[PDB]
Curated annotation (Swiss-Prot):
The lineage of its organism: Bacteria, Bacillati, Actinomycetota, Actinomycetes, Mycobacteriales. Phosphorylated by PknB. Phosphorylation recruits FhaA. Homodimer. Interacts with the FHA domain of FhaA. This is Probable peptidoglycan biosynthesis protein MviN. Changing residue 251 to A: Abolishes phosphorylation by PknB.
Amino acid sequence: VQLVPGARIANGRYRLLIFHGGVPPLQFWQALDTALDRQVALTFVDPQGVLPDDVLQETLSRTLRLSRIDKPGVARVLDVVHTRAGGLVVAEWIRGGSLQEVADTSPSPVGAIRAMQSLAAAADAAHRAGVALSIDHPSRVRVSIDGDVVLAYPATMPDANPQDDIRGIGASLYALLVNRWPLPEAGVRSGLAPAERDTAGQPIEPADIDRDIPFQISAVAARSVQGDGGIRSASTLLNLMQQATAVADRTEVL
């Protein structure tokens, strides 16, 4: 079939508006719910049917498992339906902007790390619940008006794991900090340039690229983005985020 703006999906209930990219076979869409007249976040799980039913089923399952976690870091799942275009994960629409859009406004460092805490925290409840967020691509998250960073398009496939979440979270923090995506790219419609690599392949640290960025805040970004090691828990990740914040509010004025 075909997915393009205007399409009507699910007995026509949803009309597509904007394509927000994804990591195939996933597709992140912005759509209008014509029965309740309000926007929703569609995650299509497999438009072309390329997935073995076994993987599909595990994907819905882990997504559902993620759904019952109620934290501001994750969009609320409204439904999970099978449509003419494959499995479909319907989520509330988060007012604000994409992760791409906000980073292009070189936002305050302190404002950025502070806003990431909702993401790290939701990560933590998830992991403690045995399910990953799958922060694998910048389109996956938005920034809400209320200054939270949110998993907008839920859809947790088999490959998603806690450790990749920590990496993906920092890859977001990094994005806000330097408007660059320090991860290889497994995407369509990424919208963000790649991060400069040092000689050892590790991304150049945020502070070195812009010495205005407090040291603590650039540390949490880099020690997190590298799967090399260091941070190995949303739990710890959050606390680092929090200490980095306190140091920063104090020092902020100066």
